[PDB]
Structures are given as C-alpha cells and as structure tokens.
Amino acid sequence: CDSYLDIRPVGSVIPQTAEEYRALLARAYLNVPNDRGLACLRSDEMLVNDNEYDRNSYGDIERWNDVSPFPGTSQFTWSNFYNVLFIANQVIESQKEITEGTPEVVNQLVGEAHLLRAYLHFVLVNLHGQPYTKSGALNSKSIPLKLDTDLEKTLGRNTVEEVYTSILSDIEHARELINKEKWETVFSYRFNVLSVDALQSRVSLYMGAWPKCLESAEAVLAKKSVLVDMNETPLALPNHFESVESITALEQVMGSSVNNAVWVPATFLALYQEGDKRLAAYFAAPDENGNRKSSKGGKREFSCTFRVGELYLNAAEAAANMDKLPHARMRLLELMRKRYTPEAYAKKENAVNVMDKNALISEILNERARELAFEGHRWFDLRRTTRPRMVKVLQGKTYILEQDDPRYTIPIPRDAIAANPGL
Amino acid sequence: LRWEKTQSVNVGLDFSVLNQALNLSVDYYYRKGTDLIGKQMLPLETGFV
C-alpha cells in the first residue's frame, strides 16, 4: 500500500529549513519598494529636471496631477508591496513547520516577518490612506490588509483605524519574538531588537500618541544614542549603512532614476542656516538657478529605514507636544550640536531656549526637514502635522495644493484598480 | 488545492419488447464541471499576477 500523505516533490526548491526560510525572507527584503522617495517627490524638497524623458515620468507626480496623469508617468509599486507581504505572511504561517533551526532563530525569523508586515502596512497606509491625525479619517477605507497567503480571495479596503490596529498588533508580536540585538553590517537590513522600538516610535508619532512615541524613542535611545559628529567629519552622511547612526539599513529610499531626475530647489535650501554641515555634506555645488543634486541617495549603500537622528527628533517632538519643553530642548540641540558649527550652535541654543511650545514645535519640524532631507521623510511629515498649502512654480506655470487637500493622499495605482475593481 | 468538481445528472430509459426482439436504452445527461484548474488573472493584493 502507501504511507502517510507526506511527500515532497523533487523538481524545485521547497523551503522547509530555517536557512531556506531566511533565504525566502531575504528575497522579500530585496523587493521592498522605494516608494517613499516617489512620495516625497510630491513635497517641497525635490525638483524634477527641465528636460524631457524625465518630465514624462515624475512631472505629474511633482505637480499632483492625479486626475489626468501622463500615460508614461512613474507608477507606485502596489504589486511589490503585496508580494513582500505575501512572503512575510508565508513565513508567519509556517512557524511550526520550520525545521533544522534553534528556537531562537525561528522566533527571530517570525518576528522579522511580523515587523516587515507591520512596516509594509504602515508605509502603504501612509501612501494611499488618509492621515491618522486628520479628522474624519479613522473610518475611511485606505488599503486592504494582507494577513494571510490566500489566493482565491479578493481583499477589500480597511479603514485607517483597522490598519493601524494591525500595525500595532504586529509590532507587539515582533517585540516578543525578535531576539537579535545587533546584525552584521552586510546583513544590517534585517530587523534588530531596536528596530521594533524605532518602528513603534514612528508609528506612534504618525498616530499622534505622544507618550508612547516618547517612551519608545527613549527606550531605543538608552542603548543606541551616538550620532555622526559632522563637525569632526564634514563629509560623513548618517544615511550611510556603515554609519554608527544606522539601525536598519533596509530601504534605499531614492532609486537611481529618481535621484538622477531630481534637483533640490533653492526654496528648500533656504531652510539651512549659514553654518550647517548638512548644507555641504548632503548636496553638491550650486547651479545656474541654485539647484543642487543630492549625494544622499541613489545608490544602494545609502540604505536606511531607521536611525538615531530620526529618533532624536521623534523624542523632541513627542516631548514638545505634551508640555515638556525642558525635555524637548534637551533632546533637541543635541542633534544641532552634531550638525551645526560651534559658532552657529550657540545662537541656535539661545533661539531654542527662547521659544514657547508652538515655536519649538515649528523649529523641531524644520530640523526634521533639514536633517531627514532626501530620506523619504517630507511628504509624510507634511501630512502628519499641518497639511500646509504649497505653491510650486514649474515650466512657467503655477500649481497650488490647498491646505487639507484631498491630493495629500496618493490614489491607489491604476493597475491595482484594474486587477481589483472594488478598490 | 483540491479536485475539480463535476455536478452531473442523468435520466435514462430502458425498454425491451417481444422477448428481447428489440431493446432501447436512452440516456440524457448534463454534467457541469466547476472548480476546474487553470490560469487565472488574480488581483494584485495577493503576491502574484
């Protein structure tokens, strides 16, 4: 007769070992979309080139031309998000079926999958969903949640509250499973123990939960606090994966094409003070109109999802938002000390010490804009705080994005709608 | 993954007359097969096209 119905085919690679599941998860890590830079294309920190073959791709994104974009405009990768989500869910579902691995290794694999799922849902719901802090947005259908590996099911859009509940649940699941304090530099894209806290801090900052944001930022800051002192090294980028500032070097925010096809407008560069090491380290020499190409991305070695510089600002903003100006002014001015010259840092310290909570919050936001420039942290930080009216003059025309615009949310890509009409 | 369903009905007549001098057997059938395995264009919310 036969035996148990436990037979594996022998023509392909069927992942069963912890090594094979790590290979599958590494392939998932590879395909994390670079859509945060494409989203920041809609902010005030990027300027597409004035030549053709580059306007056709990113111009309509720059001008918020959602209703009638160019046929050849660059599309947001809705498919890659859910491919990586499928692999994350496969690793999550095969917990007890992973063999030839110690309990700690399998637990960390599943925790990394949980955190990858939470991070992907977070960035997806911030791309194509209304901001959490916006009034009337907690019950608006944003994106479907990929919580299984089902193939014969059509997913419907979830409300923003459900998506964020899932993100927080997965962060909690990953907190109790990830057990690796530090990864190798070459393998640094994988989520560590501090990655859970950094993601929790960012999620709570985007949600508006200031106490939890500050708690998580302080929890990660008790272990990793050392910044890149660019007064000692005037050419060291914290965005670099070799940096001591990096926590997770996963997402290369700016792709080669996107980086090569954008300048930095002089209006954005006017936010930098006279003595600022970021002014020269981040960008190149000026041009005819004062526009600078950015040397902070476009190649795979400038990969960074989380780092200490962002968490300092997270803690500063959380402290400033709950009437803790001592704490905010302490966490702040600890970043400018590492980014400003000593001649300008004293003036910055005096200015910071002579503001109230609203002016301090505005200064913290400006410091976030300067520090996290070309790191996929401008469009979303615009959506979080105020949704300010933005005027952009391009090709002799003017384009105006009103305050609280419906265009602050990027519509779901056309391929996603074509495959799933109820989207 | 499963088998492919085939829901079928059959109505048949058996007739025999004159010491089997002539036998007739008619069968009308209707077989509707569903859950057939084939390539489908899936929604992009799963990992595949």
DSSP 8-class letter at A155 = P
* Spatial distance between the Cα atoms of A313 and A373, rounded to a whole number of angstroms: 13
Quote the distance between the C-alpha of residue A295 and its chain's center. Answer: 19
Beta-carbon-side half-sphere exposure of residue A215 (alpha carbons within 13 Å): 7
C-alpha distances out from residue A38 to A203, A375, A376, Å: 20, 11, 8
CA distance readout (Å), A344 to A270, A338, A340:
16, 12, 6
Interface residue ranges in chain B relative to chain A, Cβ cutoff 8 Å:
41-49
Amino acid code (one letter) for A273? Q
Angstrom distance (rounded) from CA B32 to CA A339: 73
Which among A85, A415, A145 has a CA at the least distance from the CA of B43?
A415
| Pairs of CB atoms within 8 A across A/B | 40
The reply to whether residue A82 touches residue B42, judged by beta carbons under 8 angstroms, is: no
Map tokens 């920190």 to a residue.
A45
Cα separation, A43 vs A62, whole angstroms: 8
Of B41, B42, B47, the CB nearest to A87: B47
A144 CB neighbours in chain B (<8 A) are 45
Neighbouring CB atoms inside 10 A of A390's CB total 17
Q: Using CA atoms, how far apart are residues A85 and A304, in angstroms rounded to an integer?
A: 20
Inter-chain residue contact B45 with A420, CB threshold 8 Å: yes
Experimental method, per PDB record: cryo-EM
Cβ pair A18, A99 in contact under 8 A: yes
What are the chain B neighbours of A153 within 8 Å (beta carbons)?
46
The reply to whether residue B47 touches residue A420, judged by beta carbons under 8 angstroms, is no
Closest CA to A73 of A91, A48, A93: A48
- Residue numbers in B near A91 (CB within 8 A): none
> B48 to chain A: which residues are within 8 Å by CB?
83, 86, 151
Residue of A nearest to B45 (CA): A82
Q: Is the dihedral of CA A269, A274, A275, A281 positive or negative?
A: positive
